[PDB]
Amino acid sequence: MKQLEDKVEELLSKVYHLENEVARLKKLIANKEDKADMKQLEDKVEELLSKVYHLENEVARLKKLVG
Amino acid sequence: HMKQLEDKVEELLSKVYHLENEVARLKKLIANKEDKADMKQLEDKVEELLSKVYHLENEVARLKKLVG
Amino acid sequence: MKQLEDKVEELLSKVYHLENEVARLKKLIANKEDKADMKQLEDKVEELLSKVYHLENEVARLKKLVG
């Protein structure tokens, strides 16, 4: 009967520790970069490349005309 | 008292089940995280953009002065 | 006693396996990019997007004026 009580006690402690380890693991995971975030960043750079290209072309035409 | 212990194991049964589900959820989240990589390619593109934007700023300042 | 002891042993096996899974996930997590290490790239891109927005507006204004 002390045999069972001690097994249940081992289970209690190990469950409690696992709960804390999982809580820490989710905090760590939350601080990692999402694939979606990287994709957003790449698409913003693509947007910037395109806008800068158009601006260059626009500025070149303005420059000629102002002359 | 055996009932008290049964209730305790019932609690732990549920907690172990929840923990199994939390671990599977965390696996899925990890799969959607970006692997460490060399940032050279993205950084080089941003460096090109900052140079082009700097040069554009200078050009647009000149025109703004002339037109005004 | 026996039936409850067996249930407890079953749960100890599951907890044991879970501890190993968690150790393993910690290792996977180490191969992932830290969000904080992307902060500089992200901010630079946000700066550039604003600068390009303002440059576009100024160019369109000048163009209209000259045209």
Side-chain angles (χ1 to χ4, degrees), chain B residues 1-2 4-27 29-64 66-68:
Chain B
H1 183 48
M2 216 66 177
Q4 305 317 118
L5 277 343
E6 285 176 13
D7 293 0
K8 199 73 176 155
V9 168
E10 196 167 297
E11 286 179 31
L12 292 165
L13 171 81
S14 289
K15 287 186 170 168
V16 168
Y17 176 71
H18 286 125
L19 279 170
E20 288 173 326
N21 289 332
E22 262 304 314
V23 168
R25 189 189 151 261
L26 293 181
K27 276 176 189 173
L29 296 189
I30 292 160
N32 297 327
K33 298 298 182 188
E34 188 74 5
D35 289 302
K36 274 185 196 299
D38 193 334
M39 282 299 108
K40 181 112 290 282
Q41 194 180 350
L42 210 45
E43 293 178 344
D44 286 358
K45 212 57 127 164
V46 170
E47 189 189 313
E48 183 193 310
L49 287 168
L50 79 76
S51 302
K52 286 185 165 161
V53 165
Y54 161 77
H55 177 80
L56 277 168
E57 286 174 329
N58 294 343
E59 295 278 66
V60 176
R62 285 175 189 279
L63 299 169
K64 180 160 188 164
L66 272 302
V67 168

Side-chain angles (χ1 to χ4, degrees), chain A residues 24-26 28-38, chain B residues 26 29-36, chain C residues 25-26 28-39 42:
Chain A
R24 275 191 288 287
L25 216 74
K26 64 176 63 163
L28 291 184
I29 289 162
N31 290 325
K32 300 297 185 158
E33 173 89 344
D34 267 308
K35 293 188 183 172
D37 295 335
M38 186 62 99
Chain B
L26 293 181
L29 296 189
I30 292 160
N32 297 327
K33 298 298 182 188
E34 188 74 5
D35 289 302
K36 274 185 196 299
Chain C
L25 290 181
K26 280 180 172 155
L28 291 182
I29 286 160
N31 296 154
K32 299 301 185 166
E33 195 81 67
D34 288 307
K35 183 64 165 172
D37 297 358
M38 300 302 298
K39 162 73 159 149
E42 287 164 3

Side-chain angles (χ1 to χ4, degrees), chain A residues 4 7 10-11 14 18 21 25 29 31-33 37-38 41 44 48 51 55 58-59 62, chain C residues 8-9 11-12 15 25-26 29 32-35 38 45-46 48-49 52 56 59 62-63:
Chain A
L4 178 64
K7 293 274 84 173
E10 182 187 6
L11 185 53
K14 289 189 198 270
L18 264 177
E21 292 289 334
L25 216 74
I29 289 162
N31 290 325
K32 300 297 185 158
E33 173 89 344
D37 295 335
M38 186 62 99
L41 187 62
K44 277 169 189 276
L48 285 162
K51 287 186 179 180
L55 260 173
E58 288 298 291
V59 164
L62 249 194
Chain C
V8 166
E9 291 291 343
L11 293 170
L12 279 158
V15 160
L25 290 181
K26 280 180 172 155
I29 286 160
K32 299 301 185 166
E33 195 81 67
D34 288 307
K35 183 64 165 172
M38 300 302 298
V45 165
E46 291 305 307
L48 292 165
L49 284 166
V52 165
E56 290 178 325
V59 165
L62 266 22
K63 183 182 180 176

